[PDB]
Amino acid sequence: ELNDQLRVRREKLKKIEELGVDPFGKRFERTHKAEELFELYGDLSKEELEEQQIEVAVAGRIMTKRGMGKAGFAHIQDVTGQIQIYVRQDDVGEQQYELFKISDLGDIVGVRGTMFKTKVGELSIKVSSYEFLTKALRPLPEKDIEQRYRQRYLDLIMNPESKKTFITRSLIIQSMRRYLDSHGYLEVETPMMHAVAGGAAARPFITHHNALDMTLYMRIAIELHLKRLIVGGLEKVYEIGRVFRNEGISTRHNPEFTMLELYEAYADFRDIMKLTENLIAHIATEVLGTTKIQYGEHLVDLTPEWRRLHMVDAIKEYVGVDFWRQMSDEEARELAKEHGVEVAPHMTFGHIVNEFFEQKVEDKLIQPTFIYGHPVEISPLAKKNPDDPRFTDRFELFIVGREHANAFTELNDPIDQRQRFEEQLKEREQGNDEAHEMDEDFLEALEYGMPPTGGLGIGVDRLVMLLTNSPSIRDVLLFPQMRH
Amino acid sequence: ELNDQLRVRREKLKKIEELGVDPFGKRFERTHKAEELFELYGDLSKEELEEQQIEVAVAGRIMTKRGMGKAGFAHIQDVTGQIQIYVRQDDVGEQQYELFKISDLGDIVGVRGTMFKTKVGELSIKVSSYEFLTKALRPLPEKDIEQRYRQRYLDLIMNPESKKTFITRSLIIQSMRRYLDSHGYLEVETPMMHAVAGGAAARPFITHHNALDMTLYMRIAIELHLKRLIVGGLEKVYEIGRVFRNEGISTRHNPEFTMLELYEAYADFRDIMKLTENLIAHIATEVLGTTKIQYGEHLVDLTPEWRRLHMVDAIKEYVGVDFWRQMSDEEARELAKEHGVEVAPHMTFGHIVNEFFEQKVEDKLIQPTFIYGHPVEISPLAKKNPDDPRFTDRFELFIVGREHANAFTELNDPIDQRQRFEEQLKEREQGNDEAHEMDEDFLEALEYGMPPTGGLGIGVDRLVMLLTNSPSIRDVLLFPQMRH
Numbered sequence: 001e002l003n004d005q006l007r008v009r010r011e012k013l014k015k016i017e018e019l020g021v022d023p024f025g026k027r028f029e030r031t032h033k034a035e036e037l038f039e040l041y042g043d044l045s046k047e048e049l050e051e052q053q054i055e056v057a058v059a060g061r062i063m064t065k066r067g068m069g070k071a072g073f074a075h076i077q078d079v080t081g082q083i084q085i086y087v088r089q090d091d092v093g094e095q096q097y098e099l100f101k102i103s104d105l106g107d108i109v110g111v112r113g114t115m116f117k118t119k120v121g122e123l124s125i126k127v128s129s130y131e132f133l134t135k136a137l138r139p140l141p142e143k144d145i146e147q148r149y150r151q152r153y154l155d156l157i158m159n160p161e162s163k164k165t166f167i168t169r170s171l172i173i174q175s176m177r178r179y180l181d182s183h184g185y186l187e188v189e190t191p192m193m194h195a196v197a198g199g200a201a202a203r204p205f206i207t208h209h210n211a212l213d214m215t216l217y218m219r220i221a222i223e224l225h226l227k228r229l230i231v232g233g234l235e236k237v238y239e240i241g242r243v244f245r246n247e248g249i250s251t252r253h254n255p256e257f258t259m260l261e262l263y264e265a266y267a268d269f270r271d272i273m274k275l276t277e278n279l280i281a282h283i284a285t286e287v288l289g290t291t292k293i294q295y296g297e298h299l300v301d302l303t304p305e306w307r308r309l310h311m312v313d314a315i316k317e318y319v320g321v322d323f324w325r326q327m328s329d330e331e332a333r334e335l336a337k338e339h340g341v342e343v344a345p346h347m348t349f350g351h352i353v354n355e356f357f358e359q360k361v362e363d364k365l366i367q368p369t370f371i372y373g374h375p376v377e378i379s380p381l382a383k384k385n386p387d388d389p390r391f392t393d394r395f396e397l398f399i400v401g402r403e404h405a406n407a408f409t410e411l412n413d414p415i416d417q418r419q420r421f422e423e424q425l426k427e428r429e430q431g432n433d434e435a436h437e438m439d440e441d442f443l444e445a446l447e448y449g450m451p452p453t454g455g456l457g458i459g460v461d462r463l464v465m466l467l468t469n470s471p472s473i474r475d476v477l478l479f480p481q482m483r484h
Numbered sequence: 485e486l487n488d489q490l491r492v493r494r495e496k497l498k499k500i501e502e503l504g505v506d507p508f509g510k511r512f513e514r515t516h517k518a519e520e521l522f523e524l525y526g527d528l529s530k531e532e533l534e535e536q537q538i539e540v541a542v543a544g545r546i547m548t549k550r551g552m553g554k555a556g557f558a559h560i561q562d563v564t565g566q567i568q569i570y571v572r573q574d575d576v577g578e579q580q581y582e583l584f585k586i587s588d589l590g591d592i593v594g595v596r597g598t599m600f601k602t603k604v605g606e607l608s609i610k611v612s613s614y615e616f617l618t619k620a621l622r623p624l625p626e627k628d629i630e631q632r633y634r635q636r637y638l639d640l641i642m643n644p645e646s647k648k649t650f651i652t653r654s655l656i657i658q659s660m661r662r663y664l665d666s667h668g669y670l671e672v673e674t675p676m677m678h679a680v681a682g683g684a685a686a687r688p689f690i691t692h693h694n695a696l697d698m699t700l701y702m703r704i705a706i707e708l709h710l711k712r713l714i715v716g717g718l719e720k721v722y723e724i725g726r727v728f729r730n731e732g733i734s735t736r737h738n739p740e741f742t743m744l745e746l747y748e749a750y751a752d753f754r755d756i757m758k759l760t761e762n763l764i765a766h767i768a769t770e771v772l773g774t775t776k777i778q779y780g781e782h783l784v785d786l787t788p789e790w791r792r793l794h795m796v797d798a799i800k801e802y803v804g805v806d807f808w809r810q811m812s813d814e815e816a817r818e819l820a821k822e823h824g825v826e827v828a829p830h831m832t833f834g835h836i837v838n839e840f841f842e843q844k845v846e847d848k849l850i851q852p853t854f855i856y857g858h859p860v861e862i863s864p865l866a867k868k869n870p871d872d873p874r875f876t877d878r879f880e881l882f883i884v885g886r887e888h889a890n891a892f893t894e895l896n897d898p899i900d901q902r903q904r905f906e907e908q909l910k911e912r913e914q915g916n917d918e919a920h921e922m923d924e925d926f927l928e929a930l931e932y933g934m935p936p937t938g939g940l941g942i943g944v945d946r947l948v949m950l951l952t953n954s955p956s957i958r959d960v961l962l963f964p965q966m967r968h
């Protein structure tokens with residue numbers, strides 16, 4: 001097992017050093033990637049290749065190897081795929097051949113040679129120069145799901161498919177910045193360490209600054225500092241960055257994740273709905289070529305315009321209870337009991353409406369849907385709806401049964417905002433340890449005047465999951481948080 | 485007094501509501517920015533303007549106001565600048581004119597009207613519709629440095645040159661990603677919360693995950709996880725993200741900053757030198773239009789190729805001391821005493837060489853200089869130079885007397901690497917509380933084989949300071965860390 005093959009690999013390490021070669025290599029110049037070779041010469045016949053003597057230089061990890069006396073084959077793998085190499089002793093010389101023979105699966109090498117096809121028609125490289133680049137002290141794993149996440153590098157090597165999800169992830173984010181940049185939004189960087197962790201309902205990670213002897217909280221949202229920039233007059237700003245929440249992991253939750261937050265002065269949540277469907281459609285179109293995608297067993301149509309549905313109307317359609325009716329908190333609690341909806345001590349009418357939605361409705365929303373009108377009690381930073389103040393002009397985007405975005409007509413009334421924070425502090429006294437805390441610096445900012453604004457927050461990891469048909473967030477994160 | 489002004493603004497808020505207006509506004513559609521207006525017709529005589537009746541719609545903060553009677557003026561400011569508005573009671577009507585009259589400096593408004601020039605020919609908007617958008621409860625500052633950092637929004641409103649710095653910052657980062665993307669590097673996101681804080685010599689911020697009951701350290705570098713991706717076979721990766729160091733602030737230090745870390749398989753530190761100068765020169769050319777820049781009292785030429793200077797040769801040129809000669813630790817300590825170079829208990833020849841450089845040489849490196857050959861003792865993750873192993877194939881980029889980048893031919897030998905960490909542990913016991921920790925997970929990764937690689941780390945904030953002629957990092961960070 002270990003120390004077994006391990007001792008052998010250490011032994012070969014010394015043998016290589018004794019042959020006057022650096023077992024960990026120097027720089028190496030390549031001319032092609034494996035895939036490029038196939039694209040360019042894959043359809044040429046054995047004869048055509050012999051007549052063109054195309055010389056190339058490539059490098060990669062040895063994945064397979066078969067020795068045959070004075071000559072041998074091996075498949076080396078680079079970031080684009082595998083290419084077979086053929087090494088003959090009489091061609092590369094005794095010294096280089098000795099290096100080929102001592103080479104192990106896992107070792108990394110560089111080669112120069114001419115393109116040719118074997119009798120089975122496999123495009124290969126007839127090696128003229130064999131360069132040893134790096135000795136692998138451990139063998140490639142036996143070719144479990146957890147190892148893929150615990151040791152991502154092994155996943156990337158053994159499951160060539162896996163890298164594609166991450167390449168696509170980069171294209172998704174680049175497409176996102178392209179759209180926002182071209183539409184006038186300024187990409188900014190605001191603090192990730194806050195005096196007060198606000199902007200969302202979540203438990204924060206607490207830390208300490210030694211030199212300044214100060215308690216800091218990793219940000220649970222980007223909202224409050226971006227709003228300060230709107231007060232500052234920047235008008236259109238966005239930030240795609242890490243957010244941290246001290247909470248358990250799930251197929252859709254990781255303690256550190258990437259969120260897009262953006263704010264636009266002079267817009268309201270209806271404008272943000274349009275921006276959201278356009279942005280996501282733009283991304284899907286550029287990256288996948290279409291807005292009609294497959295996710296799990298669902299055919300999801302991301303083609304704008306998406307469905308708009310008030311949360312109360314959603315509960316009426318999917319459950320049957322009509323919360324448009326003015327009722328007491330006690331009446332709402334009774335309904336919750338009758339319909340199997342779990343509620344907490346601090347909850348009143350608004351919280352209960354939301355619980356009805358989350359527990360009995362949201363998982364049925366497969367096609368992109370803008371659920372709007374969130375009760376005021378759970379929307380401390382959103383402006384109340386003018387017609388019915390029990391609700392706010394806020395919406396959440398639901399796709400394949402989960403929330404992908406959250407946005408609102410931002411609350412810019414400082415007096416109302418202070419009141420919302422006071423109500424949140426009261427909720428905390430009643431058991432809601434996720435309630436928003438007071439932020440006087442933020443209220444001060446609002447007092448200098450924040451224009452009417454439309455704000456948006458998108459879970460980038462979740463969007464990447466949707467567009468790559470990944471069932472878990474652990475599949476779109478290179479190094480997801482692992483349990484002890 | 486200020487207290488008096490607050491009461492007044494508080495009462496005006498009530499009078500506006502009494503006028504049936506939402507004092508915090510609704511969405512407002514605009515057609516132009518203040519600067520666009522001047523660009524499109526800042527020279528068009530009042531005649532043509534009067535004939536064309538060019539209707540426009542803008543919005544912004546009232547910075548100045550003047551006039552009495554049934555006609556008045558005001559200068560509103562948007563993200564691009566200021567534009568004078570002319571409001572006449574006989575045009576907008578009684579109710580709207582009353583709103584104009586009650587409007588305070590600081591309040592935000594939207595207007596629709598036609599372009600025109602006053603007697604003095606000042607481009608202005610002849611208002612046809614006056615929309616009150618937001619009441620400022622606090623007065624704008626009457627037209628302190630640290631105060632501008634504490635309330636960045638006030639700075640952005642009162643000082644237009646500051647906002648430009650941040651717009652330029654975004655352009656610099658955009659230009660950086662374009663270059664890297666176009667040169668084949670894959671943009672990735674790796675963990676910011678680590679089991680073991682490694683990749684640099686620095687004190688970490690410590691935190692705790694409750695549900696997992698796990699101690700986590702905010703990353704002090706991005707290196708170790710990116711190296712895992714190189715083992716993973718990704719070949720070219722980069723990440724521009726936040727890094728956290730539990731240390732005091734300075735003219736070029738903030739507890740959380742942005743760093744670019746990049747790794748390229750099959751390249752060495754010389755290749756990285758070229759990449760670094762080409763990248764920075766590219767960004768300068770794109771953003772400033774030239775590689776000739778000004779920083780403080782210095783004229784800095786960023787045109788490649790930059791000077792390459794070995795640390796030992798730099799000390800010889802500036803201090804008159806030669807460290808190429810083989811010498812004992814005591815001989816080095818003797819030289820340190822003679823030249824007034826402070827040293828710590830855990831220091832030997834290698835550390836002392838670096839102390840000579842940092843204490844007597846670095847501040848004089850104004851023009852871009854690649855200082856290379858750092859002693860192995862202070863380079864635990866860099867490969868030793870083949871000809872003189874007392875030094876490593878590492879370089880730091882110095883410009884205007886400070887370090888902007890750190891890079892090396894990566895140490896891919898797992899056996900050597902473990903030994904480097906062991907020597908680091910020894911130093912920690914000798915008083916070096918910034919010594920690197922023993923990362924078994926990282927060592928395991930190298931044991932599967934990491935190809936020869938060239939790595940780079942650039943302080944983005946410092947690069948932004950350089951290209952925006954900002955004397956402090958506090959000038960290029962929207963919200964720099966404030967003291968208590």
Ligand SMILES: Nc1ncnc2c1ncn2[C@@H]1O[C@H](COP(=O)(O)OP(=O)(O)OP(=O)(O)OP(=O)(O)OC[C@H]2O[C@@H](n3cnc4c(N)ncnc43)[C@H](O)[C@@H]2O)[C@@H](O)[C@H]1O
Nearest residue numbers: 200247248250252253254257403404405406457458459462
């Ligand atoms: N820790 C947990 N473990 C298991 N189940 C849990 C759970 N927390 C909640 N659930 C369950 O998931 C369902 C919905 O819960 P909700 O609490 O209503 O929604 P959420 O998934 O927690 O996102 P959040 O409400 O915080 O979004 P936010 O606007 O702040 O932020 C904006 C966007 O950021 C993204 N986002 C938020 N948190 C994220 C995370 N930790 N990881 C990745 N993305 C995240 C999302 O796209 C979100 O729309 C319910 O069944 C609930 O019980």
Ligand SMILES: Nc1ncnc2c1ncn2[C@@H]1O[C@H](COP(=O)(O)OP(=O)(O)OP(=O)(O)OP(=O)(O)OC[C@H]2O[C@@H](n3cnc4c(N)ncnc43)[C@H](O)[C@@H]2O)[C@@H](O)[C@H]1O
Nearest residue numbers: 684731732734736737738741887888889890941942943946
């Ligand atoms: N906190 C402090 N306050 C006052 N004086 C101090 C100080 N720390 C050091 N000094 C003094 O500055 C001079 C040089 O000290 P050094 O310790 O050699 O320089 P450094 O600025 O600390 O860069 P470092 O070595 O940590 O960067 P790294 O490659 O790891 O990482 C790669 C790149 O990241 C950037 N970077 C590193 N730390 C940063 C930070 N905290 N903020 C912004 N950028 C940073 C840089 O561009 C660096 O090249 C000496 O006089 C020293 O005493």
Ligand SMILES: NC(=O)[C@@H](N)CCCC[NH3+]
Nearest residue numbers: 199200221223407455457
């Ligand atoms: N929940 C959150 O993280 C919010 N800060 C996302 C943005 C909502 C609209 N302002």
Ligand SMILES: NC(=O)[C@@H](N)CCCC[NH3+]
Nearest residue numbers: 683684705707891939941
């Ligand atoms: N000291 C640091 O932060 C290094 N991780 C910067 C990169 C050096 C080259 N690998």
Ligand SMILES: [Mg+2]
Nearest residue numbers: 201202245247
């Ligand atoms: Mg949550």
Ligand SMILES: [Mg+2]
Nearest residue numbers: 358396403406
């Ligand atoms: Mg939610």
Ligand SMILES: [Mg+2]
Nearest residue numbers: 396403405406
């Ligand atoms: Mg949400």
Ligand SMILES: [Mg+2]
Nearest residue numbers: 685686729731
């Ligand atoms: Mg430092």
Ligand SMILES: [Mg+2]
Nearest residue numbers: 842880887890
């Ligand atoms: Mg240094």
Ligand SMILES: [Mg+2]
Nearest residue numbers: 880887889890
């Ligand atoms: Mg440095």
